[PDB]
Design a protein around this nucleic acid. Structure first.
Lengths: 104, 240, 348, 113, 274
RNA sequence: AUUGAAAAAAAUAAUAUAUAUUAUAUAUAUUAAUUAUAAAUUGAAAUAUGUUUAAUUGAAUAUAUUUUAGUAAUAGAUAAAAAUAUGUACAGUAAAAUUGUAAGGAAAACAAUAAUAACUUUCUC
């Protein structure tokens, strides 16, 4: 009951014709969070990428960084909808109003 | 013999090392050889049929010449499989603002500023400091207490010399070498440290030691350090 | 440019063809390859890209290194060290490679491959060590030629044989090959190619051919018979084809007798052995030695005692085999020998 | 005929495979063959020379360490024990990072913590 | 066959022999793999490697200074123990097994210039257990390893038989790839640069992990592989993704040397050491 | 041989032709191919013939012809999971146990686990 595609007669790679596998790759530039760019040899066909979050903006990798901007995936939620739909009620002064319930 | 602690700071390179002329041309030769043996690009997988991006890529590319009966070809009958001639390399032409890499030559390079930590991004900078005289050398700090390890003594004394404006790492408590002098009966121990943030900024106004500093590399260490001092430390530096 | 000058370096360290040199040293991709002759094939051929610029710098890199080695070679005095330094200086010359890999190494011409130059001597040694020596020793081993005749062999000189007079067809004999009685009926020649630095104005060689398979019905065993023997043969790195030109009747200690096997006497192995005479110093000219023809059995011949008595060092060998055929009788009468004996087909 | 998953996987296997996806063998002229050999020979020598230079530097560095240790031990054993202490859990500061092809927008920082 | 008795005849010469070079068959295996004339030829030094350079520039001398122990000596490993000679039964007795182990352990040499902890290989193990039913999914593993690592993946087939797990012997389930040289360097760099700094609860590699004599291993979950550039670009064509095992082999004699070494390549550690 | 560049050759081996010998050798010429093999209204590419725009010529443009797409694993003389269990030639060494690794645990897959005296070559002080 296993899903297995039937195997065809394997072609004979006789001795001496064993060519290496050289997969098509592109000299692709990787743009980090900062202006740092590293050239990476990749198969996917497009030359530049931006990394929204990377080692640059990770506290674990930069313990000494006092200022560290943080950005996460933008699919929907706070940064997307909670902000534009609630663009009047403002502040962390306001966070001190709901600071504690003063309950044991 | 009094013990004297010296500290050599190193600024690790921020960018990849530059390549020699032989390295540049040899690599180019190999890359072209690899492109000659390069495989066909499987565009039929990444670019699905009917996708607008797929059809944009097709127009973005230039097709190969196909074999055709009754027409002579000087360079040979075309051999195309999966839409690519098999007798030569294949060229695949590829906010979303374009990636503009930053220049590898900074302002400090053109201005020839010596105090800055960006004068040579791809090299290793060493903090060389001048004495009362014109003799430039690594900072030598004298201790008498002996209640602290030598590498810690250099670290704490360095921070108070820079006004707590530096962040240095102590690689190891093992001194790198000895610079013994017989005239003053002084034994000098060098400790390897790495600068992480901040600058030196000498602020000691008591004139206890040092007047000028620099962030030279090995090539420039040679021209400013005296030959005798240089000879006993040539091996403790990084070429690149 | 040490490699460019020819004030003292031999001319052999160069490409004789001008067109080849011009392309190999071309400054721009404007000359078509010489090797590919048909213009149609010339058009089809496509050189790899960015191969000229890197080659020029690679040439310079080696050029400087060769110059340093030559300077070092100038200040030394030991001939063995001097030869090693020279080989080390020029082994990387593209011209030397082109001259060697691409032209005959056996029948080398003095213009391209000169075996007086240490570099071509070294390259020839390595080449012979790759295939020829490896094949020879396997033939001598699996055919039990070594222990039967000599305790061992440590090759130092390629040996090749031929029978140009018998039939008139040119073919270098592969070791251990099977030869008819007609082919080996007249005489062998030798090409004792040396590769080790040796004083070729003083050193002398001997050549013996032995057949340790002749039946000995007295002891129900075999006995070794000397086939052909030459002594006091001079040689030269580039002219070392031993033939009736290069030796006289004084050198022949045993005139050649054809391989003449008997019917059902089994295969017979003829092992060529090439030694070198002792080199005694404190004397001018070669050390001619008078062989003692008195004993020289040539019918029951003991090579081991022969070598020990005259202090010969073996440097190369060759082997061929022979069985009975119809031509043996004709060979016997041609050489005026008694008719061969006929044996049984079974061992009992 | 065949399930869509099999069609997709066959395509993925096709990207793996080498069938009708490789060019003709690289054929070089006799003289370009010698050209290539000398290129590689230089590169081999060049890499060996760089490696030997690094090894020789490390030879001297170790020589310097031990002479420093020997002198520190004879003069002031109090510091020597601290110097000879193990570094089993030593870790490089994570602020140090491998060089990047091109520099960042901010080359350096003058503030810490 | 008349007999089954292997006995090689001794030879009478010292020259090393190799029947491959003097057999006319296979004229193309005679050429070395690196040789241009071989059909197996593949360029090696296409471009410079930044990670390797970093190790040779900065971390090389640093590690020598770190690990150096003054006048340290070789610590012999647990070897086989010989039989003390006190009975006539020890003449042909095989030696005893090591003290606490059934396998011999290697010696630990002091760190010097010649031996400085450094990388040597990285192996990716991927065992899709779900392939027991759908074999077609094992192919997706090879593609995933191919796209990410960039090298040809060698497939992984079953070896044991556990009925409790519906495990059958002799079926393909995963792929593995051996990485060395520059390609391994790129993988290690892109792992710490991109994939690692994208897990919400990531703390680092456990200090308890690692073979006693060099070698450190960790594992990436199914969702972590989506962070690779070559899957993030084509999420449409990657409906199913699944984890793998990573093993970094190094020249470190002991583990703690390796951990210090790998830390130089931007690897964090969180647990407590042994 | 014609086809953009302005007398030749001196290796092994392959192919084509020829001929010397009771010798599977020699002479000349040149360095092919090396992952393929029928069957596609439909996808892609190409040349030729016209048109429209934009001499030539760029793009689009209709037709004719052809080529790519049948997308399928071994790329290593492969080496302890499965299939060819008798011949020959070449080559290699298993197994347990231990330490680790996302699901993974006692039991799935991967990695590591005895010593370099002497010799050859290369680089180097």
């Amino acid at each position: 009951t296993r899903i297995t595609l039937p195997r065809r007669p394997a072609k004979k790679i006789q001795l001496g014709k064993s060519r290496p596998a050289i997969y098509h790759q592109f000299n692709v530039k990787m743009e980090l969070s900062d202006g740092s760019v590293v050239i990476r040899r990749s198969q996917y066909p497009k030359g530049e990428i931006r990394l929204i979050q990377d080692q640059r903006n990770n506290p674990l990798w930069n313990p000494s960084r006092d200022d560290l901007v943080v950005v996460d995936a933008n699919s929907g939620g706070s940064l997307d909808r909670f902000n534009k739909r609630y663009s009047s009620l403002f502040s962390t002064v306001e966070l001190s109003e709901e600071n504690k319930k003063k309950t044991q | 013999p009094k013990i004297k602690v010296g500290v050599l700071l190193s600024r690790i390179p921020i960018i990849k090392s530059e390549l020699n002329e032989l390295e540049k041309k040899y690599y180019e030769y190999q890359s072209e050889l690899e492109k000659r043996l390069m495989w066909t690009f499987p565009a039929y997988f990444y670019f699905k049929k009917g996708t607008v991006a797929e059809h944009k890529f097709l127009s973005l590319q230039k097709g190969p010449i196909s074999k055709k009966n009754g027409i002579w070809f000087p360079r040979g009958i075309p051999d195309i499989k999966h839409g690519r001639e098999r007798s030569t390399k294949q060229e695949v032409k590829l906010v979303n603002r374009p990636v503009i890499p930053n220049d590898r030559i900074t302002e400090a390079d053109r201005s020839n500023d010596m105090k800055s930590l960006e004068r040579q991004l791809s090299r290793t900078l060493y903090l060389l400091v001048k004495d009362k005289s014109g003799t430039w050398k690594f900072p030598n700090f004298d201790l008498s207490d002996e209640s602290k390890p030598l590498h810690v003594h250099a670290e704490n004394e360095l921070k108070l010399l820079s006004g707590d404006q530096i962040y240095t790492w102590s690689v190891s408590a093992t001194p790198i070498g000895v610079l013994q002098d017989e005239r003053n009966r002084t034994a000098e121990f060098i400790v390897k440290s790495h600068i992480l943030a901040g600058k030196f900024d000498l602020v000691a106004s008591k004139n206890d030691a040092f007047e000028d500093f620099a962030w030279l590399t090995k090539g420039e260490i040679s021209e400013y350090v005296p030959k005798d001092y240089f000879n006993k430390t040539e091996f403790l530096l990084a070429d690149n | 440019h040490i490699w460019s000058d020819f004030t003292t370096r031999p001319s052999s360290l160069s490409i004789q063809s001008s067109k080849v040199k011009n392309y190999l040293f071309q400054k721009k991709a404007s000359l078509d390859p010489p090797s590919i002759s048909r213009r149609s094939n010339r058009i089809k051929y496509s050189p790899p890209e960015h191969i000229d610029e890197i080659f020029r710098m690679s040439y310079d890199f080696l050029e400087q290194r060769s110059s340093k080695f030559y300077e070092l070679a100038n200040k030394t005095k030991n001939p063995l060290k001097k030869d090693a330094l020279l080989i080390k200086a020029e082994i990387n010359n593209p011209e030397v490679q082109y001259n060697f890999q691409f032209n005959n190494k056996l029948n080398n011409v003095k213009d391209i491959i000169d075996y007086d130059v240490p570099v071509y001597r070294h390259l020839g040694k390595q080449h012979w060590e790759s295939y020829g020596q490896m094949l020879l020793m396997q033939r001598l081993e699996t055919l039990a030629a070594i222990p039967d005749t000599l305790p061992t062999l440590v090759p130092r000189a390629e040996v090749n044989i031929k029978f140009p007079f018998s039939t008139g067809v040119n073919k270098w004999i592969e070791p251990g090959e099977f030869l008819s009685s007609n082919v080996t009926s007249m005489r062998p020649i030798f090409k004792i190619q040396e590769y080790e630095l040796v004083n070729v104005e003083k050193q002398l060689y001997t050549v013996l051919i032995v057949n340790p398979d002749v039946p000995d019905l007295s002891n129900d065993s075999f006995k070794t018979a000397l086939c052909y023997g030459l002594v006091n043969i001079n040689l030269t790195y580039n002219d070392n084809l031993i033939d009736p030109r290069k030796f006289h009747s004084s050198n022949i200690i045993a005139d050649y007798l054809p391989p003449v096997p008997e019917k059902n006497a089994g295969k017979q192995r003829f092992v060529v052995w090439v030694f070198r005479q002792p080199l005694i110093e404190d004397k001018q000219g070669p050390n001619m030695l008078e062989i003692d023809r008195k004993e020289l059995s040539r019918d029951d011949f003991d090579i081991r005692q022969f070598t020990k008595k005259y202090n010969l060092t073996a440097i190369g060998a060759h082997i061929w085999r022979s069985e009975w055929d119809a031509k043996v009788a004709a060979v016997r009468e041609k050489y005026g020998l008694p008719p061969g004996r006929v044996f049984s087909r079974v061992r009992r | 005929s065949l399930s869509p998953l099999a069609q997709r996987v066959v395509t993925q296997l096709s990207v793996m495979s080498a069938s009708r996806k490789q060019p003709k063998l690289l054929k070089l002229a006799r003289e370009d063959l010698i050209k290539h050999q000398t290129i590689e020979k230089c590169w081999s020598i060049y890499q060996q020379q760089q490696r030997e230079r690094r090894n020789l530097q490390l030879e001297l560095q170790y020589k310097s360490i031990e002479r420093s240790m020997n002198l520190l031990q004879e003069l002031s054993p109090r510091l020597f024990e601290a110097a000879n202490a193990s570094e089993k859990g030593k870790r490089f500061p994570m602020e140090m990072k491998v060089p990047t092809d091109f520099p960042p927008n901010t080359l350096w920082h003058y503030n810490f913590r | 066959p008349k007999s089954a008795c292997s006995l090689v005849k001794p030879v009478h010469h010292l020259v090393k022999i190799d029947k491959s070079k003097l057999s006319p068959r296979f004229p193309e295996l005679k050429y070395d793999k690196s040789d241009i004339r071989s059909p197996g030829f593949k360029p090696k030094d296409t471009h410079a490697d930044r990670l390797n350079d970093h190790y040779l520039n900065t971390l090389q001398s640093d590690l020598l200074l770190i690990n150096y122990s003054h006048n340290a000596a070789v610590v012999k490993g647990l070897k086989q123990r010989a039989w003390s000679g006190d009975s006539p039964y020890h003449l042909n007795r095989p030696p005893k097994n090591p003290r606490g182990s059934k396998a011999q352990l290697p010696d630990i040499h002091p760190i010097k210039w010649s031996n400085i902890p450094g990388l040597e290989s990285v192996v990716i193990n991927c065992f899709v257990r779900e392939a027991r039913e759908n074999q077609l999914l094992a192919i997706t593993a090879a593609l995933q390893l191919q796209q990410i690592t960039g090298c040809k993946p060698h497939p992984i087939f079953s070896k044991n038989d556990v009925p409790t797990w519906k495990l059958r012997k002799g079926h393909q389930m995963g792929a593995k790839v051996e990485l060395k040289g520059k390609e391994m360097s790129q993988f290690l760099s892109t792992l710490t640069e991109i994939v690692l700094p994208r897990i919400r609860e990531y703390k680092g590699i456990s200090n308890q992990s690692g073979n006693r004599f060099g070698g450190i291993s960790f594992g990436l979950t199914a969702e972590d592989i989506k962070f690779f550039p070559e899957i993030d670009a084509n999420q449409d064509s990657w409906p199913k993704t699944f984890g793998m095992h990573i093993n970094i082999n190094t020249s470190a004699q002991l583990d703690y040397q390796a951990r210090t070494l790998l830390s130089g390549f931007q690897f964090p550690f969180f647990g407590e050491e042994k």
